[PDB]
């Protein structure tokens, strides 16, 4: 139980230099970065709660020092802090997986590896030593490493009313741990602490509707999944799908008139979007210009709902008599050419001259459209890289950046009368800016504090590396809104299974 | 000779814990952050070329380690590297100033302090021991420290080649250096390295003209000063003047359209801009909406110069009858209000009602306007801490972010016709985003590389903490342009009077 | 770490644990540079006393990462060393701090305490707090934890004004329990360690804050109302609507005394004079302009206040042409005094223009058709007339310029202000006197009489005063918090705009608490 697998001390005889650590980092324990997780009666047996590579990143002092070195060798001593209670009983399993071996799928295969069983009522203060299984006399960064795995063995049950149990891990290098090679401190390790400069949300741009400031943060019950293409960013990859780092700059686009039309009470003329970055229109590149609108207007109701936009005919060094018309994606009454994110569109123009360039500024929606229709985005098909659809873990809801879009009216028959609507974006580039500097620990999620009334009120959100925020809510409702005073603050790294202690009541 | 002042070894009897260093840190020199400067025959006599506090910030490794500790004690060993040649006649002096002693302004007096003298022709490196002068057991953050001062002892009189000589420093702690009292590694000091993202300029927003992508970088020998109020950001105060971090969100504004008029061949009516951030219009706060517009039509023109904006009537839900009209700041007849960047504005709309809300979108410019007129912003008066006018050091020129503004035309009586024009911005918030995460060392400037053709062409700029970039030029031109392919790269920290080695020759 | 002791609870359904820990070793100064080393009474080392601002409550709502307690290691921790320190110039040595936890075997959660060295920022997350030397408790078994807090310094002994280390306490894991109203209570006690010493006896007159503040038993009705002299204070008041105060007369602060335009003699300074400058403004009657005289600011510079010291801040309204006005005595100045003193209507600045409508300046209205040119006149604010009510008088006119006026203040969320009311008599006239005022009430944030005693005994740095208000011979007691900025707040749960509290008086001092402290007593406004 103390030592599932023996730890073999290396002599470091091949290292050009052996760099010793401060004697005092060996003596005191610190919390493991990302070593916190929670167990609930709803957790299913055989589900992985925590997965850690035995690495200098298990401790924040060695994690900070590791930015300065090229090699390392040695194991760690872990200690388990359990906030249990007198009524609940369960059981956990912790195992060591040697490098180059796949992690099992079920608890009963996990027992094949060196392991040991934890019982919730006796687990507190248990000590486990995690050895490092090494090939060379010492490690170079980028090698494959063994890892510790914690899994539910017997589900949590309670005689009285059920309580959650929160687990913490603390660690310290084992006396044989050592570094080597002393390189400049800009290495690729993720820093144990992330510093976020203060920037209120309303100071951030709304990627899915520029020119309208973020009014407030938003949580809705109905919005269970996101399939957007513009507000998607990722720390590992940057802009995803059709996103851009300058939403306002890429908002405007142009299109060329096309032969033909379709049926409608007025006339529905064709157009074809220009693709400066896809001149040949090959299947492997985006069908539409980067940063263009992705609002949806009905699955098939081309006539009930309409997108609206400024449009003007091309002229040397400018455009002429820009005015507001209706438009929409695809030719309608089709699977791949209706409500689809592709380059074919139609415009509500009585007289559209063939093979002429035209402006297209998405502006706002009109007709019977409402915010619910707007959020659903047109579907994407093909081989080009489009942002995957995402959903929050069960029991959590998305947090959106909300913007309000003014309506547009007209006495003259300019062509349209837009309808006021609200716009939501799941992420904004400004918040991600800081993260690129400091990477995320592998497979870990950032827990952020959002404090509003000068410390009086604090909300807790989880920011995933895929680029969305979630909140744990006892209630689920459509109209809940958080103010935008701002001041995000970083709290700690948590396992993706972690459940936020602070709860937001939405039905009330 | 190398140790004019001996080092006193503290017993550290009052330190709760004594934390040792990795022994290999003592045996390796590294460059001193911000220890680079140049000297030439144009250097003024008696000026201090360099002034460094003796602290853990002199070495890359101790600077990174110091973030983990609360106190320190010990001195440093320094080396000077001179890049002169056989024609460089002159001498240099380096001295050690104890705390609370004022630095004199004559090399003759510096010989009183413990010093060392070197010749500009030396190809080796001169070494000097910089001890830790203190009357306390060890140092906390924020104490008064001894300094190293470098000054010209005998001036450069050869004046045959007349080229700049570049000086660098390297350092390593002395064997008696120690730390104390481990703490979590989070501090508010500037990091010695400023890894910048890979974003090219064309993916950055133009503060003075959103909706138009940045198309190139621009140098013009005529623009000797900048008085803008929008693209102004500083490292130590964030947004300055009337600037904002979401220029697109704050582009639009509203006015009330009060009574009155002014003389003109058409009829122009007055209006007052709404000030949500300054509801009561006190003199201490800005007199215009945050980040609205500072294009500066012209010094005195009613029939030749005009700005054109989209405007519409305020109604429930939104705005009605949005179309392009002329407008301008203040009234042309009187001084101090003609072009003054304040509340009162023209509107060219005969059918403009009384005390009714209206929408404004600066859009473009019309008339006889050109690039030069747009470049100069309206004057600012009052006591609302506006952004001051700035100029580059002699021999350097600004580098601007340049964007193209399409013209809007009309074949009917819509009213206005704009003309093509180009808009320049001093700085973009996107570049400054990462700078705030990694602050600037006090009293230093960042030297940046600009890589264009996969490394075949590299330019060098200086980014001042006041928020502008400059380049070293020799020719004389008014239309030099640079591609926006991008990939800014960080080189090092240099003194504000550093002379860049790479020269942009404008005659090509 | 040093030792641990376990005991069985009565009934044998759990245990309690007492521990002694020294997370950071103590370095004992040799005191070789001290001219004299002065010892303490040996019985002072054996007497644990409660630490000022050393109490807080943990409930299920409290979240980890919020700093519940933060104290400097200094002689101010102990009641007797604080009193002794006034006789000495320097000190040296650490303290033993004891955490007392009222836990139970059928709860859950953890607690963390850490020592912060000088000149280090305090983080806001339990994750980072584990970087410091620390200790962790569990609510199921925690009874008392003793911390040997060291005295971290780089000098032989301390003088007044140095930077000192701190103790910080935070929730490590949230509290849980079957009952929804269970909560843990935490308290701190301290005593100097055996190596603590003083040095260099000096006469006992220092600027420190006395550990105990003695409040005279003068009742509120014996105190003056800064914003309405000549009318005694009649009761204390709480209003839910009044969420902020922008007054400039009843403003006093512990450090720099009077604030904005306030004065220590409100009755004396209640009078002012004007010059009756030319010009006029429209109206059904005829209104006149006058410029207030500024004896303290003879040259009208923007640095100094633009109105007479402690003059008047009623507040008439954002716009009131023929609805609301201020009424005052007025009389033309003659040799030896003034003649024909009678009531007239007046207001601040002009009406239409902004920045002068409701603001502090020399310009004021006069309701005098026969106002002689460039002649001095007397002004006694009296009261209000027209459609004015309590709300209009409550909101004072705005302040502009750079004359370091009194900033607007608001209470912490969940708390409400406590005011001093006063019935302003109404003035009626039957003949052609000219004006007719109406009854109205005036509120003041604070009275100089209460703050007068506090100046003698300053507040400990970073602490507020918790006061007891005894009314019916001790049977009924109310709790208020007195902030250094000069206002009182109470904890409320209901919602009412007319809550009244008698003015029997007898203010009493309870203890020093943190600004974020939550009052145990609650005032129900619905009753």
PDB file of C-alpha atoms in Angstrom, chain A residues 16-25 28 60-61 64-69 181-186 191-195 197 201-206 210-214 244-246 248-252 310 315-322 361 404-412 414 420 430 433-434 436-437, chain B residues 16-25 28 60-62 64-65 67-69 182-187 192-193 195 197 199 202-206 210-214 244-252 310 315-322 324 363 405-412 419-420 430 433-434 436-438:
ATOM      1  CA  UNK A  16      27.721  15.625 -17.378  1.00  0.00           C
ATOM      2  CA  UNK A  17      26.589  17.528 -14.283  1.00  0.00           C
ATOM      3  CA  UNK A  18      24.448  16.561 -11.302  1.00  0.00           C
ATOM      4  CA  UNK A  19      22.460  19.566 -10.100  1.00  0.00           C
ATOM      5  CA  UNK A  20      21.257  19.327  -6.507  1.00  0.00           C
ATOM      6  CA  UNK A  21      18.043  20.821  -5.161  1.00  0.00           C
ATOM      7  CA  UNK A  22      17.471  23.145  -2.244  1.00  0.00           C
ATOM      8  CA  UNK A  23      17.468  20.865   0.830  1.00  0.00           C
ATOM      9  CA  UNK A  24      14.222  22.430   2.056  1.00  0.00           C
ATOM     10  CA  UNK A  25      12.028  21.426  -0.897  1.00  0.00           C
ATOM     11  CA  UNK A  28       7.652  20.066   3.248  1.00  0.00           C
ATOM     12  CA  UNK A  60       4.996  23.088  -7.940  1.00  0.00           C
ATOM     13  CA  UNK A  61       8.526  23.755  -6.676  1.00  0.00           C
ATOM     14  CA  UNK A  64       8.976  25.739 -11.497  1.00  0.00           C
ATOM     15  CA  UNK A  65      12.588  24.561 -11.396  1.00  0.00           C
ATOM     16  CA  UNK A  66      12.112  22.200 -14.341  1.00  0.00           C
ATOM     17  CA  UNK A  67      11.809  25.151 -16.733  1.00  0.00           C
ATOM     18  CA  UNK A  68      15.538  25.658 -16.132  1.00  0.00           C
ATOM     19  CA  UNK A  69      16.863  22.126 -16.763  1.00  0.00           C
ATOM     20  CA  UNK A 181      22.073  20.376 -17.752  1.00  0.00           C
ATOM     21  CA  UNK A 182      20.961  23.874 -16.604  1.00  0.00           C
ATOM     22  CA  UNK A 183      19.398  25.326 -19.805  1.00  0.00           C
ATOM     23  CA  UNK A 184      17.830  28.813 -20.164  1.00  0.00           C
ATOM     24  CA  UNK A 185      14.431  29.111 -18.429  1.00  0.00           C
ATOM     25  CA  UNK A 186      12.092  29.224 -21.422  1.00  0.00           C
ATOM     26  CA  UNK A 191       3.925  26.749 -15.433  1.00  0.00           C
ATOM     27  CA  UNK A 192       2.302  25.573 -12.175  1.00  0.00           C
ATOM     28  CA  UNK A 193       0.644  28.995 -11.748  1.00  0.00           C
ATOM     29  CA  UNK A 194      -1.235  31.003 -14.375  1.00  0.00           C
ATOM     30  CA  UNK A 195      -1.330  34.797 -14.071  1.00  0.00           C
ATOM     31  CA  UNK A 197      -4.178  40.232 -16.267  1.00  0.00           C
ATOM     32  CA  UNK A 201     -15.691  40.947 -20.051  1.00  0.00           C
ATOM     33  CA  UNK A 202     -17.255  44.125 -21.438  1.00  0.00           C
ATOM     34  CA  UNK A 203     -13.734  45.173 -22.418  1.00  0.00           C
ATOM     35  CA  UNK A 204     -13.549  42.046 -24.602  1.00  0.00           C
ATOM     36  CA  UNK A 205     -14.790  41.770 -28.177  1.00  0.00           C
ATOM     37  CA  UNK A 206     -17.684  39.495 -29.108  1.00  0.00           C
ATOM     38  CA  UNK A 210     -18.563  42.634 -33.433  1.00  0.00           C
ATOM     39  CA  UNK A 211     -19.589  46.293 -33.072  1.00  0.00           C
ATOM     40  CA  UNK A 212     -21.789  45.407 -30.068  1.00  0.00           C
ATOM     41  CA  UNK A 213     -20.105  45.340 -26.633  1.00  0.00           C
ATOM     42  CA  UNK A 214     -20.495  42.309 -24.394  1.00  0.00           C
ATOM     43  CA  UNK A 244     -10.089  34.672 -36.428  1.00  0.00           C
ATOM     44  CA  UNK A 245      -8.135  36.827 -33.992  1.00  0.00           C
ATOM     45  CA  UNK A 246      -9.526  40.048 -35.544  1.00  0.00           C
ATOM     46  CA  UNK A 248     -14.105  43.060 -36.768  1.00  0.00           C
ATOM     47  CA  UNK A 249     -11.519  43.094 -39.547  1.00  0.00           C
ATOM     48  CA  UNK A 250     -12.833  39.887 -41.120  1.00  0.00           C
ATOM     49  CA  UNK A 251     -16.526  40.725 -40.654  1.00  0.00           C
ATOM     50  CA  UNK A 252     -16.935  42.265 -44.107  1.00  0.00           C
ATOM     51  CA  UNK A 310     -25.763  45.992 -46.319  1.00  0.00           C
ATOM     52  CA  UNK A 315     -17.028  50.545 -58.209  1.00  0.00           C
ATOM     53  CA  UNK A 316     -13.420  51.546 -58.756  1.00  0.00           C
ATOM     54  CA  UNK A 317     -11.935  52.300 -55.351  1.00  0.00           C
ATOM     55  CA  UNK A 318     -15.170  51.843 -53.440  1.00  0.00           C
ATOM     56  CA  UNK A 319     -18.791  50.760 -53.482  1.00  0.00           C
ATOM     57  CA  UNK A 320     -21.971  52.605 -54.425  1.00  0.00           C
ATOM     58  CA  UNK A 321     -25.425  53.100 -52.872  1.00  0.00           C
ATOM     59  CA  UNK A 322     -25.125  50.500 -50.130  1.00  0.00           C
ATOM     60  CA  UNK A 361     -22.219  42.795 -44.117  1.00  0.00           C
ATOM     61  CA  UNK A 404     -27.614  42.761 -27.829  1.00  0.00           C
ATOM     62  CA  UNK A 405     -28.159  43.653 -31.485  1.00  0.00           C
ATOM     63  CA  UNK A 406     -30.191  46.810 -32.262  1.00  0.00           C
ATOM     64  CA  UNK A 407     -32.986  46.597 -34.816  1.00  0.00           C
ATOM     65  CA  UNK A 408     -33.297  48.602 -38.033  1.00  0.00           C
ATOM     66  CA  UNK A 409     -36.503  50.115 -39.411  1.00  0.00           C
ATOM     67  CA  UNK A 410     -37.451  52.122 -42.488  1.00  0.00           C
ATOM     68  CA  UNK A 411     -40.383  54.146 -43.777  1.00  0.00           C
ATOM     69  CA  UNK A 412     -39.367  53.715 -47.414  1.00  0.00           C
ATOM     70  CA  UNK A 414     -35.602  49.996 -48.720  1.00  0.00           C
ATOM     71  CA  UNK A 420     -33.977  43.030 -32.222  1.00  0.00           C
ATOM     72  CA  UNK A 430      -8.921  38.296 -25.342  1.00  0.00           C
ATOM     73  CA  UNK A 433      -4.431  35.701 -25.033  1.00  0.00           C
ATOM     74  CA  UNK A 434      -2.799  35.148 -21.643  1.00  0.00           C
ATOM     75  CA  UNK A 436      -0.858  30.942 -24.745  1.00  0.00           C
ATOM     76  CA  UNK A 437       2.051  32.207 -22.639  1.00  0.00           C
TER      77      UNK A 437
ATOM     78  CA  UNK B  16      14.945  31.417   9.781  1.00  0.00           C
ATOM     79  CA  UNK B  17      16.297  29.131   7.047  1.00  0.00           C
ATOM     80  CA  UNK B  18      19.309  29.299   4.740  1.00  0.00           C
ATOM     81  CA  UNK B  19      18.604  28.006   1.237  1.00  0.00           C
ATOM     82  CA  UNK B  20      21.565  26.882  -0.844  1.00  0.00           C
ATOM     83  CA  UNK B  21      21.904  27.250  -4.606  1.00  0.00           C
ATOM     84  CA  UNK B  22      22.728  24.685  -7.245  1.00  0.00           C
ATOM     85  CA  UNK B  23      26.557  24.730  -7.274  1.00  0.00           C
ATOM     86  CA  UNK B  24      26.721  24.918 -11.074  1.00  0.00           C
ATOM     87  CA  UNK B  25      24.945  28.290 -11.122  1.00  0.00           C
ATOM     88  CA  UNK B  28      28.394  29.962 -15.620  1.00  0.00           C
ATOM     89  CA  UNK B  60      19.090  34.856 -15.746  1.00  0.00           C
ATOM     90  CA  UNK B  61      19.237  31.926 -13.337  1.00  0.00           C
ATOM     91  CA  UNK B  62      19.142  33.854 -10.058  1.00  0.00           C
ATOM     92  CA  UNK B  64      14.263  32.892 -12.129  1.00  0.00           C
ATOM     93  CA  UNK B  65      15.169  31.343  -8.773  1.00  0.00           C
ATOM     94  CA  UNK B  67      10.688  34.146  -7.620  1.00  0.00           C
ATOM     95  CA  UNK B  68      10.649  31.210  -5.170  1.00  0.00           C
ATOM     96  CA  UNK B  69      12.222  33.051  -2.224  1.00  0.00           C
ATOM     97  CA  UNK B 182      10.793  29.460   0.234  1.00  0.00           C
ATOM     98  CA  UNK B 183       7.497  30.918  -1.018  1.00  0.00           C
ATOM     99  CA  UNK B 184       5.097  30.053  -3.851  1.00  0.00           C
ATOM    100  CA  UNK B 185       6.580  31.276  -7.153  1.00  0.00           C
ATOM    101  CA  UNK B 186       4.282  34.197  -7.961  1.00  0.00           C
ATOM    102  CA  UNK B 187       5.548  37.785  -8.083  1.00  0.00           C
ATOM    103  CA  UNK B 192      13.529  38.639 -18.045  1.00  0.00           C
ATOM    104  CA  UNK B 193      12.200  37.018 -21.260  1.00  0.00           C
ATOM    105  CA  UNK B 195       8.242  35.216 -25.630  1.00  0.00           C
ATOM    106  CA  UNK B 197       3.014  35.023 -29.963  1.00  0.00           C
ATOM    107  CA  UNK B 199       0.318  36.525 -34.785  1.00  0.00           C
ATOM    108  CA  UNK B 202      -2.693  41.667 -40.593  1.00  0.00           C
ATOM    109  CA  UNK B 203      -4.473  39.631 -37.897  1.00  0.00           C
ATOM    110  CA  UNK B 204      -4.449  42.645 -35.542  1.00  0.00           C
ATOM    111  CA  UNK B 205      -7.204  45.225 -35.158  1.00  0.00           C
ATOM    112  CA  UNK B 206      -6.613  48.818 -36.244  1.00  0.00           C
ATOM    113  CA  UNK B 210     -12.054  48.903 -37.371  1.00  0.00           C
ATOM    114  CA  UNK B 211     -13.710  46.821 -40.111  1.00  0.00           C
ATOM    115  CA  UNK B 212     -10.622  47.388 -42.311  1.00  0.00           C
ATOM    116  CA  UNK B 213      -7.768  44.878 -41.869  1.00  0.00           C
ATOM    117  CA  UNK B 214      -4.254  46.142 -41.306  1.00  0.00           C
ATOM    118  CA  UNK B 244     -10.097  51.254 -25.410  1.00  0.00           C
ATOM    119  CA  UNK B 245      -9.194  47.577 -25.652  1.00  0.00           C
ATOM    120  CA  UNK B 246     -12.313  46.824 -27.748  1.00  0.00           C
ATOM    121  CA  UNK B 247     -12.173  49.474 -30.482  1.00  0.00           C
ATOM    122  CA  UNK B 248     -14.897  47.861 -32.593  1.00  0.00           C
ATOM    123  CA  UNK B 249     -17.309  47.608 -29.670  1.00  0.00           C
ATOM    124  CA  UNK B 250     -16.972  51.308 -28.842  1.00  0.00           C
ATOM    125  CA  UNK B 251     -16.980  52.613 -32.424  1.00  0.00           C
ATOM    126  CA  UNK B 252     -20.614  53.758 -32.384  1.00  0.00           C
ATOM    127  CA  UNK B 310     -24.146  56.425 -41.052  1.00  0.00           C
ATOM    128  CA  UNK B 315     -37.052  54.623 -32.048  1.00  0.00           C
ATOM    129  CA  UNK B 316     -38.270  51.751 -29.898  1.00  0.00           C
ATOM    130  CA  UNK B 317     -36.232  48.591 -30.428  1.00  0.00           C
ATOM    131  CA  UNK B 318     -33.627  50.244 -32.638  1.00  0.00           C
ATOM    132  CA  UNK B 319     -33.049  52.948 -35.251  1.00  0.00           C
ATOM    133  CA  UNK B 320     -34.918  53.953 -38.391  1.00  0.00           C
ATOM    134  CA  UNK B 321     -33.876  55.247 -41.824  1.00  0.00           C
ATOM    135  CA  UNK B 322     -30.130  54.687 -41.551  1.00  0.00           C
ATOM    136  CA  UNK B 324     -25.030  58.473 -44.889  1.00  0.00           C
ATOM    137  CA  UNK B 363     -17.599  55.423 -41.559  1.00  0.00           C
ATOM    138  CA  UNK B 405     -10.623  52.719 -46.238  1.00  0.00           C
ATOM    139  CA  UNK B 406     -13.037  51.999 -49.128  1.00  0.00           C
ATOM    140  CA  UNK B 407     -15.031  54.865 -50.610  1.00  0.00           C
ATOM    141  CA  UNK B 408     -18.830  55.045 -50.625  1.00  0.00           C
ATOM    142  CA  UNK B 409     -20.639  56.519 -53.628  1.00  0.00           C
ATOM    143  CA  UNK B 410     -24.224  57.113 -54.709  1.00  0.00           C
ATOM    144  CA  UNK B 411     -26.022  57.525 -58.028  1.00  0.00           C
ATOM    145  CA  UNK B 412     -29.122  59.081 -56.426  1.00  0.00           C
ATOM    146  CA  UNK B 419     -13.291  59.238 -51.239  1.00  0.00           C
ATOM    147  CA  UNK B 420     -10.572  56.597 -50.712  1.00  0.00           C
ATOM    148  CA  UNK B 430      -3.263  42.956 -29.874  1.00  0.00           C
ATOM    149  CA  UNK B 433      -1.779  42.122 -24.999  1.00  0.00           C
ATOM    150  CA  UNK B 434       1.128  39.789 -24.226  1.00  0.00           C
ATOM    151  CA  UNK B 436       1.011  43.136 -19.941  1.00  0.00           C
ATOM    152  CA  UNK B 437       1.421  39.489 -18.932  1.00  0.00           C
ATOM    153  CA  UNK B 438       5.224  39.920 -18.998  1.00  0.00           C
TER     154      UNK B 438
END
